[PDB]
Design a protein around this ligand. Structure first.
Ligand SMILES: Cc1cc2nc3c(=O)[nH]c(=O)nc-3n(C[C@H](O)[C@H](O)[C@H](O)COP(=O)(O)OP(=O)(O)OC[C@H]3O[C@@H](n4cnc5c(N)ncnc54)[C@H](O)[C@@H]3O)c2cc1C
Ligand SMILES: NC(=O)c1ccc[n+]([C@@H]2O[C@H](COP(=O)([O-])OP(=O)(O)OC[C@H]3O[C@@H](n4cnc5c(N)ncnc54)[C@H](OP(=O)(O)O)[C@@H]3O)[C@@H](O)[C@H]2O)c1
Length: 532
């Protein structure tokens, strides 16, 4: 589908973010078009088609709320939706609002440059398209550029190589194979139990163990759903008015104030219920090392009790960082998997990987021969997608250069020096620290409301004020430094990627507080922006 040469708004990306931007700008009477690398809609849910791929937020919360019809018509079937289901949902939405008519697929944005003479962006693609747009919305994701681990010999491996973030579109058959998985984040934890059912032998190459708690998935009772639908807009407002964008209970006590007995009984309740709600069991879990440690120990002990061989069990136990400060993962039959004779936990803290070889993986202790190797090694998060594009602001400043020591933004939404450019649910905003459908919807509404305001008032140039950006950055850093999150190497701090600057990238104050600030900024005529 040939993109238009001129448009009010150009949107990069056709995942949840870009699809809602497209729809809402259409409803606002603006010309808008999307460019997307993928062959079809869905973003993460299009790319991450590995077996076992599944959301870690309840289905009834991980969904769009902008359409009453969608909320009433769609039937989720389980507690946590699988990738195939979520992709059917996204297709449903795209069909319902005729969105593909406004999207060019199989096309990658390669560069974009602001023209101060015209107050427009000129955007290039890898098909030779040149598009001129007044406003540029980067809906290009947070976890959208797969990261390879930092090991030699990958190109020499003679077997089949996969990354979970670029999985094949046809099922992959691992029957009778010796298979390795590198990475035990959410992606490794989900894929490994599925591989284990086909492989002759599965080797799981763990570096730092990640905390994971049971999902306790279950079918969603259609009666509960029908009931929820009679108050769905209300239920969703309840979610928007929280720090996390879900119904998670905000435990009012301190993990230090309670007795050991009360702690165990309260944590046991969360462990049996399943899901990530334990993160908020007590108010200070992410704020006080000793509080955090009480919870962490309870979890570590549950992990130990899951695997019979106590040497294997102990190698599964996360150490050296606070519970919750790498993103909490939900597991289904992952720990149980290691009791199987054909699954092998390779502890690469103890025996670091030296190289990939034609046959497999060599650690400092031995060579593992493999027919296939699956990389669940994560993503170049938050900034990665943007840094693959040659984005140039005023005075030919490269975004990649301005952000070389970390992302610098006002509200996460724009950066000084780069007018008319907006980032959806990225650094400087709650982003992944909230249910992302809540984060995404609020960003899309705020940005598209702003663009509508500009057009209504006959303005053409919107730029974040440098001083306000510097004050925002410092503020993000100061509130993060009251938490334990900067203490740990995670993708939230860029520690994922050799050479990337280590700074915590997200707003930790909660979605609700962030939303209030955004509302106040807009109400005052976009204070901290200069509009002309
Ligand atoms: C496997 C996985 C599971 C997740 N599960 C949850 C969860 O349970 N709960 C939660 O809150 N969040 C979770 N997320 C986080 C997730 O990023 C969001 O929930 C949301 O799906 C992001 O939507 P988005 O549209 O902002 O970005 P994406 O879904 O990443 O879509 C961005 C799109 O932009 C395209 N693109 C990027 N650069 C260019 C370019 N230069 N030119 C053209 N196109 C480009 C990409 O191909 C992609 O299709 C998960 C993420 C992953 C990776
Ligand atoms: N259930 C879901 O909803 C779901 C599923 C998948 C992903 N997600 C989202 O996507 C995010 C990313 O998850 P992920 O599991 O893809 O990535 P990840 O959380 O970034 O984990 C990457 C894994 O790869 C290992 N790794 C990276 N580089 C390595 C190297 N050079 N050598 C050895 N190991 C290496 C890491 O070890 P170290 O920890 O030791 O670095 C870690 O085990 C999640 O946190 C979440 O936001 C959600």
């Amino acid at each position: 589908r040939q993109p238009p040469e001129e448009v009010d708004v150009l949107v990069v990306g056709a995942g949840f973010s870009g699809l809602y931007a497209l729809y809402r700008l259409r409803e606002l009477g603006r010309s808008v078009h999307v460019i997307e690398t993928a062959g079809d809609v869905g973003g993460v849910w299009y790319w991450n088609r590995y077996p076992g791929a599944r959301d870690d937020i309840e289905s009834i919360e991980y969904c769009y709320s902008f359409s009453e019809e969608v909320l009433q018509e769609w039937n989720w079937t389980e507690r946590y939706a699988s990738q195939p289901e979520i992709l059917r949902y996204i297709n449903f939405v795209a069909d319902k609002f005729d969105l593909r008519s406004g999207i060019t697929f199989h096309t990658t944005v390669t560069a974009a440059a602001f023209d101060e003479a015209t107050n427009t962006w000129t955007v290039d693609t890898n098909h030779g398209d040149r598009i001129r747009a007044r406003y540029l919305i980067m809906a290009s994701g947070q976890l959208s550029v797969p990261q390879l681990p930092n090991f030699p010999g990958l190109k020499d491996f003679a077997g089949n190589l996969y990354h979970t973030g670029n999985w094949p579109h046809e099922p992959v058959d691992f029957s009778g194979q010796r298979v390795g998985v590198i990475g035990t984040g959410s992606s490794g934890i989900q894929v490994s139990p599925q591989i284990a059912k086909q492989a002759a032998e599965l080797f799981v190459f763990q570096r730092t163990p990640h905390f994971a708690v049971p999902a306790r998935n279950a079918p969603l009772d259609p009666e509960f759903l029908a009931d929820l639908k009679k108050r769905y807009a209300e239920f969703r407002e309840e979610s928007r008015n929280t720090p996390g964008g879900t119904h998670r209970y905000q435990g009012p006590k301190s993990a230090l104030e309670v007795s050991d007995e009360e702690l165990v009984e309260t944590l046991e309740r969360y462990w049996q219920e399943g899901g990530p709600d334990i993160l908020a069991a007590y108010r200070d879990i992410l704020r006080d090392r000793d509080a955090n440690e009480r919870v962490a120990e309870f979890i570590r002990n549950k992990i130990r009790n899951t695997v019979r061989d106590p040497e294997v069990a102990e190698r599964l136990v996360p150490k050296g960082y606070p519970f919750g400060t790498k993103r909490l993962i939900l597991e289904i039959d992952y720990y149980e998997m290691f009791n199987r004779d054909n699954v092998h936990l390779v502890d690469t803290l103890s025996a670091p990987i030296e190289t990939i070889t034609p046959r497999g993986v060599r650690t400092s202790e031995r060579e593992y021969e493999l027919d296939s190797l699956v990389l669940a090694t994560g993503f170049d998060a938050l900034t990665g997608a943007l840094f693959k594009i040659d984005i140039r602001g005023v005075g030919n400043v490269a975004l990649k250069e301005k952000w070389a020591a970390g992302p610098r933004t006002y509200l996460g939404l724009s950066t000084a020096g780069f007018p008319n450019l907006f980032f959806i649910a990225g650094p400087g905003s709650p982003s992944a620290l909230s249910n992302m459908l809540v984060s995404i919807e609020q960003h899309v509404e705020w940005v598209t409301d702003h663009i509508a305001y500009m057009f209504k008032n006959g303005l053409t140039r919107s730029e974040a004020v440098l001083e306000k950006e510097d004050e925002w950055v410092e503020h993000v850093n100061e509130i993060a430094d009251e938490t334990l999150y900067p203490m740990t190497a995670s993708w939230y701090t860029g520690a994922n990627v050799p050479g990337k600057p280590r700074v915590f990238m997200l707003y930790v104050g909660g979605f609700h507080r962030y939303r209030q600030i955004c509302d106040e900024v807009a109400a005052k005529g976009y204070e901290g922006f200069v509009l002309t």
